[PDB]
Design a protein around this nucleic acid. Structure first.
Ligand code: MG
Ligand code: MG
Ligand code: MG
Ligand code: MG
Ligand code: MG
Length: 87
RNA sequence: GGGCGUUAAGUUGCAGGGUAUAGACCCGAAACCCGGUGAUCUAGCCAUGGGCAGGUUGAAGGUUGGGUAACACUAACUGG
């Protein structure tokens, strides 16, 4: 992912624009990467070697979302509403 | 010597018997060729119009909500 894009996401989701390790920041980065690779996997359908990384990112995002939902539901709902997710 | 002849009158008309060529005592074919008439029936094609009551199952597809990182998949409705 682009360094400028990562910096923009960190500034948008974090507090001091330097934590860059919060659950919301990680989920946003994973979602952005998945959405960017959506167009890559819509053409190269025989790229399972890179699709495994996408699946790993999906699993990591799901685990982070479950942890956020278990810890603070208020932040989880706001994050999913902002990112357009459904669960 | 042997074969063919010599030694011995035919021809022209009429009538008739017979033969040949023509259809040839008479009727009767399936069939061949040439020139014409027929697609108002029927076979096909083209152009232009008309007709198929009523009652049935419910395909592709299209929204809705979930189900996927999303395509798939799947529930109802609609669709005809
Ligand atoms: Mg002599
Ligand atoms: Mg005489
Ligand atoms: Mg005579
Ligand atoms: Mg005619
Ligand atoms: Mg009818």
């Amino acid at each position: 992912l682009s360094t400028e894009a990562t910096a923009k996401i960190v500034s948008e989701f974090g507090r001091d624009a330097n934590d860059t390790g919060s659950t919301e920041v990680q989920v946003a980065l994973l979602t952005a990467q998945i959405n960017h690779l959506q167009g890559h996997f819509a053409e190269h359908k025989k790229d399972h070697h890179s699709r495994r990384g996408l699946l790993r990112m999906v699993s990591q995002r799901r685990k982070l979302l479950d942890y956020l939902k278990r810890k603070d539901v208020a932040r989880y709902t706001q994050l999913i509403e902002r990112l357009g997710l459904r669960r």
